[PDB]
Amino acid sequence: KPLVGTGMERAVAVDSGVTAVAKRGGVVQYVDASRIVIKVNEDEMYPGEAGIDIYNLTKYTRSNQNTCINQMPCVSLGEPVERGDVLADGPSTDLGELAL
Amino acid sequence: VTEFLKPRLVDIEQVSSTHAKVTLEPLERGFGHTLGNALRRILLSSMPGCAVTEVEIDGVLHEYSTKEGVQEDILEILLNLKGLAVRVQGKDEVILTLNKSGIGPVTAADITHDGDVEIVKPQHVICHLTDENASISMRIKVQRGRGYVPASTRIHSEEDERPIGRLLVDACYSPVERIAYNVEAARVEQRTDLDKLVIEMETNGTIDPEEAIRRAATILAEQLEAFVDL
Amino acid sequence: SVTEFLKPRLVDIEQVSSTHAKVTLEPLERGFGHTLGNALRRILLSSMPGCAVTEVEIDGVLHEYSTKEGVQEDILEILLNLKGLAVRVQGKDEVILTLNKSGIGPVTAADITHDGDVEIVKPQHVICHLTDENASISMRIKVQRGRGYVPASTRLLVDACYSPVERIAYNVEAARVEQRTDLDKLVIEMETNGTIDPEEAIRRAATILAEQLEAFVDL
Amino acid sequence: NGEPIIVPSQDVVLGLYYMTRDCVNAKGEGMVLTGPKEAERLYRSGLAS
Amino acid sequence: AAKKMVEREEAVVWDILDEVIREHPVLLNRAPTLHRLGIQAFEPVLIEG
């Protein structure tokens, strides 16, 4: 993280696509280096098709500039996520804050 | 008036496990800064440490891969292992083991014990297991050395490093972290000009204060002995 | 071995023939150039015992600003010339010399009265110039043992240049053992007042440095 | 133009400006020195600025 | 054999190279060589990096 920022790092990192962010709030049922699983809060659940969200992070892969792309789960097992929240901080972002 | 007083290693305060202040009390005026900066220079540069150098994780081929059950992918597990502070009494190379299953952190208190190896911080966390039937099993390799040996230089001969599973960690055998001296006025019964040096050092635990400054003084002494007869 | 440091094997010392040496010692460990060179520099400069003219009382002068009848080198130039005086005393500790001499030429250091305790390393050294007349000069110089350097502002008075050395300056250079490229080539370089050549002043400094360390050197 | 293009540029002219200057009252003001060598030894010893 | 040795960077190649380099100047040249002092010859010093 920048020790001195301007508050815009979070907007820039979430608006970008490198971060993996929640579609619906819930409880993180299983974390892993490869994937995050989100037992959806029952309120944000459709009538049928019970489901629980699952985000398969992108591990190491070459950017257009050959630099590395990969995502780390910044949430731990059984951690309450909310909608529009960051579960995987991609490259150059720390807890969903742009960090070059 | 043509011979100096020689400093003695007076009371060694042990503030914390890692951070301790030593005091060399009877210094002539002028030798305080000289001795202190030479000792700080040596302590920061040249001290024998016990860094971990190789890791053989079980079903893993390289450091750029994931492992089911544990969230820290392998690069981060190596970065967490390099910070493992380990004091081995007997040997110059010891292979540790770390087998552990079940959810939770895999701290340094999960490494299996040898009679000579001692883990200084058993609360240092290596990785996290997040799966009921998932287990990590690594063969760590601690060894002694000086300064800093990046893997690049370390992979020079390599001893024909056959297996691909062997992930190499970058070695940091140097227990001290930051040495700060202060040269104040000792309360010697007379001789107003009598400085005392106070060497506040902060190791990672694997080396203790008195033996440390004694080692630094030995190094300075041998180099000065090469300098005393040209 | 986790304790096996390079020791310099190229101690080759060049010198300008009497009192200006230059020792290109190599190869130190990485970073040992500045530690060793700076320890020796501080020791030589600040605490290196030796004798030096500590004060002077002129037989005809009270203030530090005055003129004597026949000398053009004023009293401050006389005190400067006395500061460069390179005395080496024997077992006596606080020696006093008399400098009464009359004539017209320069007043060299050889115009000092002898003794078995003090030896002047440059009798050819000038002390003062004299008029072309009956003008005489006389004064009690006080040479006194000492360690480092003590200015008159701390203490007639004359700044005590106790230590022998006049210039030390080390330039840690690049060295190279076979494959390694980062090492230290310590180039010491010294001159002295004359009472001892530089290649021995260095070893006396290293002696004083290592014996302060004897309370921790574990053999 | 004959002017030497070995002009010291920016850290050197400031090192030399900080060196060859004077202060109205600093440590060891107004003490007669017997040559540049003694001035250097005074400065390195910490007895004169 | 010489090519193979240089290709594996034998221990002796650095002494052979320090002897090749010694009095052998090299021309250093920046991109827009506006005046002739933009191509200058230096004696090399085998540096690590």
Place this chain on the structure above:
Amino acid sequence: ARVTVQDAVEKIGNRFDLVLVAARRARQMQVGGKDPLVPEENDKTTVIALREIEEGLINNQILDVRERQEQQEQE
């Protein structure tokens, strides 16, 4: 090594005559057979020929008459 060739310039005048006269002598030594007239300090042929030009014992007339002498004794 040799930092400056200022002394070698005065012995020969031209700065290009100096280069052409020193390359000639240094190629005499290099390929070959001839020996340096000065105690070689682990130098290359270029700085050796320059240092010999510095001492006035190498130049165009001297090298040419040395040519003529060996052209004679080659017979």
Place this chain on the structure above:
Amino acid sequence: EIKELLKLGDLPTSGQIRLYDGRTGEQFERPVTVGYMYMLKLNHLVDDKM
């Protein structure tokens, strides 16, 4: 605001610290600015330029 946040920690209000030479152990005259600055590593890496 910067000075107040400095004073809330135990740093000097002037933003400047006295610093000692690492080699000679002596103190730099004229205290120096020392602070934490965010530094980026552009990919004009020398491993590609050379």
Place this chain on the structure above:
Amino acid sequence: TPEEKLLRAIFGEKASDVKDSSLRVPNGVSGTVIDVQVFTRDGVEKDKRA
């Protein structure tokens, strides 16, 4: 050519009917091979490692 001819007729090492054009790592690069992907033309025998 000639004497290369004699040097192969002496030591008898045959002249291989194949030229080496294998893909090797660039000069200076030093990194683990983290992946290998093999594509084949349709209807061409995949090797043991494809």
